[PDB]
Amino acid sequence: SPQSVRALLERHGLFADKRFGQNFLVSEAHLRRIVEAARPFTGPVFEVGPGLGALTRALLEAGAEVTAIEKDLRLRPVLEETLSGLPVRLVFQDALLYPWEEVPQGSLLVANLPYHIATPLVTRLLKTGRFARLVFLVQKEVAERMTARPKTPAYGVLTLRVAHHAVAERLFDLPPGAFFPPPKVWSSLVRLTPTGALDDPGLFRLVEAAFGKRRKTLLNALAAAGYPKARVEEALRALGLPPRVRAEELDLEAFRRLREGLE
Template sequence: MSHRARKRFGQHFLHDRNTIARIVDAIRPEPGDHLVEIGPGQGAITEPLLATGAQLTAVEIDRDLAASLRARYAAHPRFTLIEDDVLKAPLDCLQPTPLRLVGNLPYNISTPLIFRLLALPGVVDMHFMLQKEVVDRLAATAGTAAYGRLSVMRAAKASAQSVLKIGPGAFSPPPKVDSAVVRLVPRQPAFPVAAPDAFETVVRLAFSARRKTLANGLKSVLTRDQIEACGVNPSARPETIEPAEFAALGAAVAASEQTR
C-alpha cells in the first residue's frame, strides 16, 4: 500500500534512482560507519546505505512509515529505528560514536534542526537534502548575495559545501522548489567566539536591518566608536562583514554589558 505524503511533516519522497545513487556516492559510507538517517520515509536511501555495510539508526516521526520500516528491517542486524520527533529525540545518547548524519530534512524545520544537530557530540559530518535556497545560504561567504545570518551562525560551528543539486521531479510529490545536498563538517571555528549569546544578538540585529549600515543596525548595543575599536567599518553593510568580525563585535557587546 502506498503512503500518502503528509503536509504537516513536510514529506516529499525521493524516488529517482539516479539521484539516490548520486547522494549515496556523495556520502561515501564505509563498513563500520554509524549513520543516523533523519526522516528515512519510505526507505529510498536506507536500503543502499545499509548495503554499504554501515550501521544505521533511522529517526522517523510518521508512525505508519515507522511501522513499515520496522517490519521491513526487523531482522537486519545493523538497523535500529527511533520513532520520535527528531527535534526531541535523545540523539546525544547514540552509540557508538563517531556519527555520520544523513537525511532529507523537512524544509519547515530545517534551520532549527541543523543547529540542534551541530551541537551533538561525536559527529563527523552531515549530508542533508534541503531547499536549494537554504543550502546556498548555509554555504555562502561574505560579499555574496546569499550571505546572511544563517551563513555567519553556521561558520561558527561547521564548514559547508553544496555537493549536489536536485530538481523537483526526483520527488513524489514534487516540491515547488529546487533542492540540494549540503555537506556540513563540524569544527572549531577559525576565530574565537568568546560570547556566543552576544555574537548571536549582533548577527540577528545586523541582518534584520541588512540595508542599513552596521552603525545604524547595531546602535542599540554598540556605538560607532565601539565598532571601529573592533577593527570593523561602522559604515559597512552587514553582508560584507566576515564571521570573525561579527564575533569581535559580539565580544564588544558582552564587555560593554559587564561594565554597566
C-alpha cells in the same frame, strides 16, 4: 522510478502528507550520490525522515550502522517491508525531540530532511559538536544560505551559524522530479564537516543583532539592539571598516573580531 514510488505508496494505502513535508526520493543515482558524500561510515549514522526507506536501505547496504527516526507512524509497515532482514533501529518520534546531545562523538547525519525542520534541526546538531559529518537534502534556497559568501542576498545568520561550526559544501542540485510528489522548488545535497567549535552565545547575540534590522547600517542595527553606539563606532574603526558598513559585508572572522573588540 517515479512509478515504483507511486505504486509503493498506493500498495500501502499511503499518500504524501504535506504536514510532514513528505517528498520521497525516486532515483537510485541520487541515493548513490548521498551515500558517496557521506562515506566512509566511521561512526553511527542517524537518518531523520527515512520515509519509504530508500536511503535507509542504501546506507545499510554500504555497511552503515543506522538509527532512523520517523515521525509518521503510518510509514511503519512500508519501512518494515523495505528494511526486512536489515539491522536498522527504527525510532518513531519527532526528531526535534530526540536526545541529540547524547549521540556518540563521531556520529553522522545522513538524511532527506523534511523542509520545515531542516534549519532548526541542523542548527541543533551543529551545536552538539558530536558529528563528524552531516550530509542532507534541503531546499536550494536553504543550501544557498548555508553556503553563502558575504555581500550576497543569501548571506546571513544561518550562513554564519554553519560557518562557525563547520565547513559547508553544496555538492549537487536536484530538480523537483527527483522526488515524489515533486516539490515546488529545487533541492540541494549539502555536506557539513564540523571543525570543532561548539556554541558561542555571545557571538550569536551579536550576529543576530547585526541582521535584525535589515535596512540599517551595521552600526545602527547594533545600536538599536542595545550595543553602546560609541563602542561599536570604535570597534568598526579599529577593524578598518567604513562607518556605514553593513552586516552582510563581514565574514566570520570579522564578526569574531568585532565581538572581541566590543568586549
